[PDB]
């Protein structure tokens, strides 16, 4: 997260981290005891799942191994259309005051609503610096018609843009697949943005979770 703040203790119990080796690779959200909920470009092979949390990474806990994961059938790579993936956990996650399910949206939050994106990505750009503490920033939803003026072609109706005027002031490397989170309610997963991350009037994008809920719970089951 760029131009953010250390997120407030235990206010993100749905937030997870996907690790490889022991390096942070992606963020994610816990939909239930057996599933995350990340971006598709975070595939892997597998996955060590961290929750919860705030700091990577103490004790107490909990690490859980993944092994199985399913990418949305329409995911590109050239474009980042339908950039979401589900990750089946090897064992169940034990819900606590530090570990909870996200509330999936019913409704697509309109442009202009204040939101919160969070993660363990670099806090500077292009210059890498990885925080141990979960990081947090506030951000407004931006209408397709406004966002489109920046990113013409690249946008699809299932992508969502978020940012502030003026900036500067959104997600960055390693935050991919992380939550955003508007009055509720998970509206998106961080998908892509600019490099270097975050100046003034090019938004982040997001994966409108809002438009995949059908696929999401269909895709569980699986088993």
Q: What is the CATH number of the domain that holds 131?
A: 2.40.10.10
Contact criterion met (CB below 8 Å) for 16 and 28? yes
Catalytic residue among 54, 83, 175, 202: 83
User: Experimental method used, please?
Assistant: X-ray
Structure tokens at 41: 């470009």
My answer on whether 77 and 182 are in the same domain is no
Contact criterion met (CB below 8 Å) for 185 and 114? no
Total number of domains in the chain: 2
91 catalytic per annotation: no
41 catalytic per annotation: yes
My answer on whether 94 and 119 are in the same domain is no
Rounded-to-integer distance, Cα 69 and Cα 28, Å: 13
Catalytic residue among 125, 176, 191, 202: 176
My answer on whether 80 and 134 are in the same domain is no
Catalytic residue among 12, 25, 41, 50: 41
Contact criterion met (CB below 8 Å) for 37 and 188? no
| Resolution of this deposited model, Å | 2.8
The set of long-range contacts for 216-221, using a CB threshold of 8 Å and a minimum separation of 24, is 216/31, 216/37, 216/86, 216/104, 219/70, 219/86, 220/32, 220/34, 220/35, 220/86
My answer on whether 121 and 68 are in the same domain is no
My answer on whether 170 and 194 are in the same domain is yes
- The 10 Å Cβ neighbour count of residue 34 is 18
My answer on whether 142 and 222 are in the same domain is no
Q: Structural domain of residue 113, as residue ranges?
A: 1-12+102-212
138 catalytic per annotation: no
Rounded-to-integer distance, Cα 190 and Cα 223, Å: 27
């Amino acid at each position: 997260i760029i131009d953010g703040a250390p997120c407030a203790r235990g206010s993100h119990p749905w937030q997870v981290a996907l690790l490889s080796g022991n390096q942070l690779h992606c963020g994610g959200v816990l939909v239930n005891e057996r599933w995350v909920l990340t971006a598709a470009h975070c595939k892997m092979n597998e996955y060590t799942v961290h929750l919860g949390s705030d700091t990577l990474g103490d004790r107490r806990a909990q690490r859980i191994k993944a092994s199985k994961s399913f990418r949305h059938p329409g995911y590109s790579t050239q474009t980042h259309v339908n950039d979401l993936m589900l990750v089946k956990l090897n064992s169940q996650a034990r819900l606590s005051s530090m570990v909870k399910k996200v509330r999936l949206p019913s409704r697509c939050e309109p442009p202009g609503t204040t939101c919160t994106v969070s993660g363990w990505g670099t806090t500077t750009s292009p210059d890498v610096t990885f925080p141990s503490d979960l990081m947090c920033v506030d951000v407004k939803l931006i209408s397709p018609q406004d966002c489109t003026k920046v990113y013409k072609d690249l946008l699809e109706n299932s992508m969502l843009c978020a940012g502030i005027p003026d900036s500067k002031k959104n997600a960055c490397n390693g935050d991919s697949g992380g939550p955003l989170v508007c009055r509720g309610t998970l509206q998106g997963l961080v998908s892509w943005g600019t490099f270097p991350c975050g100046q003034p009037n090019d938004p982040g994008v997001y994966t409108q979770v809002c438009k995949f809920t059908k696929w999401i719970n269909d895709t569980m089951k699986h088993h």
